[PDB]
Structure 1
Amino acid sequence: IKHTLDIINVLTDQNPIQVVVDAITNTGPREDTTRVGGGGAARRQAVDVSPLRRVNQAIALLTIGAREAAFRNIKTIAETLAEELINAAKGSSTSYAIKKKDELERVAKSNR
């Protein structure tokens, strides 16, 4: 974390903690879907997540995206997570977290 925050110091960025909280905000799951029974043919129901759980898989999705971007490549966890965290501070769709976020959003829009 301190090497990552040192990288976002030198990512032409003056406010790296603001990059952290804005990527937490921008990777909030706004609409999800659940698994209702429904009698065999289970359809999907539009359901919204609690803010505590929203920051839960916001943090978790950012870390697992940085982990699988940090697996089997030379580039370290700090540099991958800095790229992940600056690509999620603004909506860019080049990051795993934004991609799974609007994937679950279009799943929630397609299941109502």
Structure 2
Amino acid sequence: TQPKLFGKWNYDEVKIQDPCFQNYIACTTTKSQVFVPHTAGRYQVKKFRKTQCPIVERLIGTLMFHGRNAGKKALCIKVVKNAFEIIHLVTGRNPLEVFVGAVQNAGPREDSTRIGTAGVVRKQAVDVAPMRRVNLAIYFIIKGCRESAFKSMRSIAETLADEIINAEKNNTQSSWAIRKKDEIEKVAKGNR
């Protein structure tokens, strides 16, 4: 039988419509269908292993990233589970089919390469890769959570939850994530 996520979230409840992300994500594999986002896997070894990482394992990783406070996946797996419960209680959708969308949206499609010649700082038009795109997307999403999450009674599992939602919506006023997603392209569309 099908191993649901956290015990209650069918993986086959999602599909990657765009071809871009098809190989640069995890929902799709048999091996990916995990109960727990903890694999102590050995990704990050070859030069593209990162791929085969169950999308959420990646989220958890990028999540335990602030110095002193972090470095302990144990907990982070939690902050992500609660956040999924919370995302569900609002749109009652398969929260992976949410987080997933968000991942696809929050990734800038264009960036500018700083190429300076003798003091002058010029830039060019650059198209952002897929692996890079997803990486940026998650990094971004989480990046923001902490932003508000600080001296706030709002919790990461809440901040994050509230983020993954709007990040899927493209709501440019409710996602520190998509703000840059747009600006980076905009500024980049200027330098180009």
State the TM-score, normalized to the length of structure 2: 0.56
Larger CA deviation: 94-103 vs 34-43 = 34-43
Give the Cα–Cα distance (whole angstroms) in 1 for the partners of residues 88 and 120 of structure 2. Answer: 52
Give the Cα–Cα distance (whole angstroms) in 1 for the partners of residues 93 and 175 of structure 2. Answer: 21
- CA RMSD, Structure 1 to Structure 2 (Å): 1.0
Displacement after TM superposition at 1:100 (Å):
0.9
Displacement after TM superposition at 1:21 (Å):
0.6
Match of 1:67 among 143, 146, 149: 146
1:98 equivalent in alignment to 2:178: yes
Give the Cα–Cα distance (whole angstroms) in 2 for the partners of residues 41 and 48 of structure 1. Answer: 23
The number of residues matched between the two structures is 112
More RCO (CA 8 Å, sep 6+) = 1
Contact 2:109 2:129 (C-alpha < 8 Å) held by counterparts: no
Displacement after TM superposition at 1:42 (Å):
1.6
Report the residue type matching 1:85 in the other structure.
I
Match of 1:23 among 94, 98, 102: 102
Larger radius of gyration: 2
Partner of 2:115: 36
SS in 2 for 1:66: helix
Q: Report percent identity of matched pairs.
A: 54
Match of 1:76 among 147, 155, 159: 155
SS in 2 for 1:37: strand
Q: Give CA deviations for 1:52-111 in whole Å, capped at 9, x if unaligned.
A: 111111111111101112111110001100111101111111210011110101011111
Give the Cα–Cα distance (whole angstroms) in 1 for the partners of residues 171 and 184 of structure 2. Answer: 16
Give the Cα–Cα distance (whole angstroms) in 1 for the partners of residues 108 and 92 of structure 2. Answer: 26
Give the Cα–Cα distance (whole angstroms) in 2 for the partners of residues 35 and 67 of structure 1. Answer: 28
Give the Cα–Cα distance (whole angstroms) in 1 for the partners of residues 123 and 92 of structure 2. Answer: 41
Give the Cα–Cα distance (whole angstroms) in 2 for the partners of residues 71 and 54 of structure 1. Answer: 27
Report the residue type matching 2:144 in the other structure.
G
